[model samples]
Target: EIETIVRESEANRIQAQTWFSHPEKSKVSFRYDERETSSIRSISIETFLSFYSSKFNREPYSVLDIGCGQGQVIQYLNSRFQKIELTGIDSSAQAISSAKKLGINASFICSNAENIMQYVSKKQDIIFIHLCFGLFKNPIAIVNTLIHLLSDQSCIYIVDLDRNSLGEGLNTAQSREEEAYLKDQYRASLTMEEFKQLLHVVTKEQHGVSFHVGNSFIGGFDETSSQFFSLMRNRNLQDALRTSVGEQLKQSQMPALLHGWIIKNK
Candidate 1:
């Protein structure tokens, strides 16, 4: 079992490195410019801000984004909040290079997530793991490392694909090609149940941690969050009608597009 785990971790590293090595692939994959994607990106950010503001007495000064492909999230945050310090980490040198090209006011480092401490010694107030959680071979161990990197009253926000509520929007796919593309995104994603189990595992081992798993951080499901969830579940179907597909998605009873995780040390 140990050997199998080691092999899996090695394979995952190699796969992530090779896939993100291509400049074009990294650039395209990290784009949050699309209408649907950008909307959810903002929603996720708002949700994080809301949660942090309500729970913690102090505001976050420093933020870190692990697997921050091309610094999409970092760029968005910087544009909105200029005073906060931002740092990005990625295993792909190609992705980091692209991020640096943006000339944003954020530091970018090319390194694997596991060796994050070597690159950054300071504890981050907010750590965002966007679209990269599923790629982790040993997610529990990686998260444990992140937990150690959190400052007091700090939180780790995870935003990624949720496998359970994914297929409901497939029924709205206009063509077989679209259907296949949507399904492909789920190949490396975790189900909502799996996420809950992950929270269970982490909290059980770590004595000073609390968590919340939900689609929208504010209320249960608002209009924007609901649309964002639907679009995310369908892998951001650019052509699909947002209203009709969103209604169909709601009828299917899919929980959320990709449920987020807000983890903090109690």
Candidate 2:
């Protein structure tokens, strides 16, 4: 069952990469200009530092970024935290290759989240599972595997979207009322109570571990500005701008929250 899911995921990733071959599609899909992407990346780094610095006394010695799409965060950390060793893993070969081109001093592996142990040592100081969790069919196994990779003082941070915080006014693709209804439906599909129960089940079955939840919000807008004009005057630029606006609309329409947890093995 797991193997079937992994194969399907890989196929989807390959299909997505084809769209990204066009610069406009890539820009539209990412929903921001390079500048905005960089800014958000910086925000993620600051958030990580603020939360974990007190525990480490200094910079963390080792970090693992799981489901690290294109390894942007890992590359950012490698640049800022020069002394720290960083590694990234993703299911997409296209993303891994793109990351390598960024000149980031990090190792990347193309593998399923459930198979991380094959590529990474189970002794990381910190492990991060970012926005990709929602894409998993069996997030429990992914979480279980991650917990096994942490040391005594180590912690696993699982970053995901809060289904409750989504709707039409927030930027849904449907009408406000329709979006609201859909959001409600999706929220009902996976309530916080249900997620907590899944976490408990995974911990008990795989690794003896427990964690506390922490929540935050991160959002911004990107539109066609002077910067957009200066970049290009072609259809590519126009399409990219439209894509950015669409993304802003979606994010604005959704009342999504950044939900996370810091967990330790028992």
Candidate 3:
């Protein structure tokens, strides 16, 4: 097996550069992947919810999802909550359009996330940036602006590919696998040290931020409509997505490498 894994050039695989610099260039494509990704994000929220409740009491929390394509994550998870304010922002007019059709309850603000402060009303309790980090020319700047949007005790979650794994997957990939991994335009997640540095860089002299590695190792691969579609055909998206990140992990291996983290502002 050709192990692409940072396998040989591990150190040189440390990538911290910006790609996908233009929003028009980056946001142009419409996709089939968000339903699949939303499944995993569903799992992520359930995981966080379980832990966060044991640690702190639920307040009247408000949440914002940056790049909230189609608002599926909130729509998928919102039913479990009775009274929480949810809001989503995305630059894709098409995504913002479909967002409401899914019966997602969040207020939709269609705009680039860098202009977030101009749109939001109050300090948010939780903010999540998922599946779209690659569109950023400066990921730190986005995180920096988030500070202005957060209360003193807010939390943030980020999920994206891991660079070493991305390289390995690409190096060993060919044909369709290559194309599938390439479809994700964002840069991979930083290693733990680099990610911790990301937190340090944004919080320099201002907020005291504490970070947690939700799942630094890696996760499940691609999903085809037919592969799992036999389970459900109608598009209510009723499942909790807890089954998704673990979905089909045993059989298929992906050329796509991913990682996730949770951070809190203290």
Error of 2 at 262 (Å): 3.5
lDDT digits (tens) for residues 104-210 of candidate 1: 99989998788888888888888888667767766777888988888877888887766654565355445564454445545556666666667666666665677
After the best TM-score superposition of candidate 3, give how far the Cα of residue 18 lies from its true spot, in angstroms. 13
Quantify all predictions' global Cα lDDT against the true fold. Answer: 0.64, 0.56, 0.55
Among the numbered candidates, top lDDT falls to: 1
Q: Ten consecutive residues with minimal summed lDDT in candidate 3?
A: 12-21
User: Taking the tens digit of each residue's C-alpha lDDT, what string does model 3 give over 146-181?
Assistant: 877776666666766554455443443344533444
lDDT of 2 by residue, 1-266 (tens): 43344444444334333333445455443442242233344444544554355444455688898878788888768766658878898776777888888887788888777788888775887888765555555565677677778876666766555556553323433234334333433332333554555555555544545654434342111233332233233343334345444334444454444445545545
Ranking by lDDT: 1, 2, 3
Find the 10 residues in a row with the least total lDDT in model 2.
218-227
Judge candidate 2 at residue 119 and give its lDDT. Answer: 83
Per-candidate clash tally:
0, 10, 2
